[PDB]
Amino acid sequence: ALTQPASVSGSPGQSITISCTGTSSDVGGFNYVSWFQQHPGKAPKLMLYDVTSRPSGVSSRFSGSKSGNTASLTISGLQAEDEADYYCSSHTSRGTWVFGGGTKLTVLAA
Amino acid sequence: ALTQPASVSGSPGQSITISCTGTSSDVGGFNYVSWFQQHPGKAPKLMLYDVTSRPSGVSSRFSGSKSGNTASLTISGLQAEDEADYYCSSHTSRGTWVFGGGTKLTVLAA
Amino acid sequence: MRCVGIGNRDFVEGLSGATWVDVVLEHGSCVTTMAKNKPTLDIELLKTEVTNPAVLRKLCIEAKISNTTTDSRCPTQGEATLVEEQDANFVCRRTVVDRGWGNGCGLFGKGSLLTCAKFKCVTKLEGKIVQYENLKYSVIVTVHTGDQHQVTIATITPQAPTSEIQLTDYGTLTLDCSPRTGLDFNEVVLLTMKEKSWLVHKQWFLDLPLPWTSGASTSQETWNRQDLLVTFKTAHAKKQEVVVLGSQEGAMHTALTGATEITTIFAGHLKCRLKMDKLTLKGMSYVMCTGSFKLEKEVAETQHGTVLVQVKYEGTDAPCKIPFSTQDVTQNGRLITANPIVTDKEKPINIETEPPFGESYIIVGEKALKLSWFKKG
Amino acid sequence: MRCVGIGNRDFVEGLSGATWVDVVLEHGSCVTTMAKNKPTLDIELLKTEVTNPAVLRKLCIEAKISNTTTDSRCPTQGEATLVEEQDANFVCRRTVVDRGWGNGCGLFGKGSLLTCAKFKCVTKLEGKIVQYENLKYSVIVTVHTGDQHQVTIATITPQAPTSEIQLTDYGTLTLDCSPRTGLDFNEVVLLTMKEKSWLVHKQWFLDLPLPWTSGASTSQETWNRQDLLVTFKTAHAKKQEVVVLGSQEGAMHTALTGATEITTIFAGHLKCRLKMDKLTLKGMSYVMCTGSFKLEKEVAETQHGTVLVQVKYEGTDAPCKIPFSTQDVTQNGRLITANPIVTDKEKPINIETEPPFGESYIIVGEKALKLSWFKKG
Amino acid sequence: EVQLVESGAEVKKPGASVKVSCKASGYTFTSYAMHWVRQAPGQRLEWMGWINAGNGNTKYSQKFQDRVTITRDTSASTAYMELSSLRSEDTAIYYCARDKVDDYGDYWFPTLWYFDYWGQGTLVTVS
Amino acid sequence: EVQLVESGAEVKKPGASVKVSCKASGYTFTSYAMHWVRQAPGQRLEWMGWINAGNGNTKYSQKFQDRVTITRDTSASTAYMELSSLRSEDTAIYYCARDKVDDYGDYWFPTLWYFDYWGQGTLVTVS
Ligand SMILES: *[C@@H]1O[C@H](CO[C@@H]2O[C@@H](C)[C@@H](O)[C@@H](O)[C@@H]2O)[C@@H](O)[C@H](O)[C@H]1NC(C)=O
Ligand SMILES: *[C@@H]1O[C@H](CO[C@@H]2O[C@@H](C)[C@@H](O)[C@@H](O)[C@@H]2O)[C@@H](O)[C@H](O)[C@H]1NC(C)=O
């Protein structure tokens, strides 16, 4: 029910934003949006919560923001390890949780 | 719970009484006593009810009476067909029914 | 002999040369009617029942809930909504709760919160409308036997209140009955609930504080005024919990103490006149009898001062008539068993008679029976 | 920040040079305590619960019957008897009925008739006695953070009403609590019934018209005063039928409307004094800071006129102190977040402040932030 | 004429359940209660119980209380008696007998001529 | 450290029921609700539900409502998730994730840092 791109690409050193669009009921209505970083065959790791807040351990490069029905997580100072799937989550008005479709972020070499 | 003899005998022409002894609760307490005549392999036939009353069809020879806790059915003008088992029945104070052990009445030839 | 054993018994005697008597029939009351040169009869209203009531309204006394869901919005962002709000099976309430940054709101304040739950009614009562036309009274009339049982009843409508009733060996009695309902059946309702039924004023019934529906089997069972069993309350400005009330069956019984308890059966009363012109007491033909009697059962007094004498006969004449009277000095005593007859010398016959107060002697002749009797008063 | 989101919030400020403040703790009420040159704290009575009540008496609100048996005797022949008359599980009533020749009696009149039925209670409530000694209050006290959650509570008895509570980075607060019960626990009973509990005057409880037993598991469950749910009535002088009353759960709820609802939990109130002598507000050591801030979240006003400002910092000094004040013409505004500090320039920090009525300007410096604010009143 | 007719002779071995029918003719079946009473070969009559054919109310005797079940099917003027968990001493001729119900449809006090008409008996036999 | 550990990799074929465990360590298990969320190989995360480990209250999502059962055993710090009547599209990595319960023991509004710690996932596979 939450929509995002399918894939997004960049190159080392650059900044890159991934968006996450929902309803008045989930994303545009509450600050209960958060971003997760999943590596292949691994648990999703919480990297952002409360649209802008970062758990201890995540560095300043990641940052979130919200506009209308669309949250946006963007990474600055791109690095090779940031190659991963990213998922956005939001609590809904009905007391449930919804995710996005996930976006595979690829960083190339040159 | 109702007691009577086991067997009683007589000869044609004579009178013969069979007694039936119970409680204040069944026989001595209520007029709900009645006598039945069973032939071998046959339904018991009601011959007396309400200690003295006879259904239409039973002749005057049979008659009943009650004294204390003991009802008594006696047959006068004894006949050969009167050879049979006789059972006494009484309603009880608790709304149930009890029978006697039955007495086999035999009439001889001479 | 149908009322002699009953305590709630009434004697109705017609004055001189009357062909008829008026009687009043209530439930649990047995009436013996008498007229001179007529048989004595026993009459009782066994049951009144109305066929085919119509369910006016079914109230529900015990309910339960399921599928609880809530919608909540942050302050400034409008009221909360749930699709179940126009599902008639759901009961709902809207309120407000505390909200801020800590629960995902960019603004501090009151946010709307709506709670909805499926309303399932577990047990119900029903008020039915009853119609005068569809009443039927069952009235049994018998003859005051004399004889022993050897080994009828009439249906009365408001549209057929007169019944001809044929009494073998005695003729035909005509029973003319008016239903005397103490009610207005449009303004009272027959309330049934878990095997037990009353009938009560209607306006009361429609004022009873329970969820109701004019339950038609043509639509699924939705409930109006669900709030009289299912409510909601706000727990310290963040939660809302459903309050179910519990089965009102006991409350209903406590409210129905001062009511009138009971196809469907009821207990009213019925006024009637019995016309006995084509009635004749059999045994008029016979001859006063010849022989001696003998007590088959001791003299027994009923709960109405009258006494019962059962006897068996001596003599040749099979069909005949018992000589009978009593004295202090003889006065022709009252007899309820009318014209005591000997139908079968084999069989024993009962005679019910009212004796005079104080000491009396009942005589029943050559070697006749002189039974001493005394009546207290 | 534990009470800023709550609406039922109280501010308690100590007068000049006070080491202590008295507070009153009710359920659903969050209190923030302040003292000059002291940290601001938040305190709330979460729950009070009594451990281990004792069942004083169990009443039964819904019963059913079984194994119905009757004994009957003819008139003159004494009263009817049944072995079940001294079986405590049976409820019984004796009466009289019409009897005569027709039902096996040699005498007409009233005969005794006794009816007995097994009394099985289907659902019950229980009143428990609660004891002041076995009360325990759960009181949580926290510091008015400033900082963000990065990814205590005290038990209070009547026998240990003072709790020392250690607050990391701030010292040790001493909380001295007197239970102020508005009750006399010997004269009130905790009534529980099918998940839900109240506490009510005792004499009322013992006067409630339901069968009871001081239920000891040492004996099987027999009932006293079974007649308040199971009775008998004589149907027209020959039958006797058992009258079961129906579940009094709804009647109980309707009677408990004007009551106080809820090992076992309760809601009272608690008076306490907080002594903060060994408390010190950390960050006293630091230096008023050098750089600019920037709003991480827009200024948000709570339900108490106070506003929340969350910011992130500019500059070199990792540990430091926010310069902070507001003006119409500057007056040192009130601050609930005491001594706003920078613990980690990476992380964002909240400051709650009471602004003056009407128009105010909050400033937080070289390129400092001038946030316009207005308060209605 | 009044007539009561029961099922055929049946032999079942211990542990089973036995059901014996009784169909009445010559009288209104719903105006009478049907009693069941058994007797082993050469021994006394032992009253089992009765059922009101009008409302289906039962009454059982203590010896059979939760072994017997007396039921009615008014459609075919029939009363049934079923015995559970049969044991050594259950072999008997089983009889049904009628007694009339009072004018209100109830059965509290029987009539003085109870059991005026009987079935002809069916043996249930053990093994 | 905070740690969530679930059961082994399990393969069951359609029609059966599957049960997967989750045992928590490093925090008071009764202070958190345990959520379950699944994802098929190469597809999105799909929130299944949660249970309050304090009072056992559950909440399910519509897609799984009467197929899922989430339970708790507080003795061993363990929450269980069982799926009934599995079908073609049930193959997934199943995760548990925690979220703290409020100071009153209730779970109405989650915390902003929900799902701060996860299990490591278990595949349930179809055939
Ligand atoms: C609504 O509830 C139906 C059954 O009622 C309740 O079901 C669960 C929730 C139990 O906790 C208990 O309260 C009742 O048995 C279920 O079929 C299902 O949960 C819901 N029905 C739907 C959604 O159609
Ligand atoms: C008492 O009743 C027990 C069970 O209660 C009722 O049993 C029958 C009579 C049904 O009609 C229904 O009312 C109840 O299930 C039975 O075990 C048995 O009848 C009696 N128990 C004894 C005599 O120990």
Author numbering:
A (entry chain L), B (entry chain L): 3 to 9, 11 to 27, 27A, 27B, 27C, 28 to 95, 95A, 96 to 106, ...
C (entry chain A), D (entry chain A): 1 to 151, 160 to 270, 276 to 341, 345 to 380, 383 to 395
E (entry chain H), F (entry chain H): 1 to 52, 52A, 53 to 82, 82A, 82B, 82C, 83 to 100, 100A, ...
Manuscript excerpt for this entry:
Here we describe a comparative structure-function analysis of C10 bound to the envelope (E) protein dimers of the five viruses it neutralizes. The neutralizing antibodies induced during a DENV or ZIKV infection target the envelope (E) protein and, with a few exceptions, are serotype specific. The epitopes are distributed evenly at the surface of the icosahedral virion, which is composed of 90 E dimers organized in 30 “rafts” of three parallel E dimers (Kuhn et al., 2002).
We determined the corresponding X-ray structures to 2.1-, 2.8-, 3.2-, and 2.7-Å resolution, respectively by molecular replacement. In the case of ZIKV and DENV1, the antibody can bind and stabilize a symmetric conformation of sE that is likely to be the most populated one.
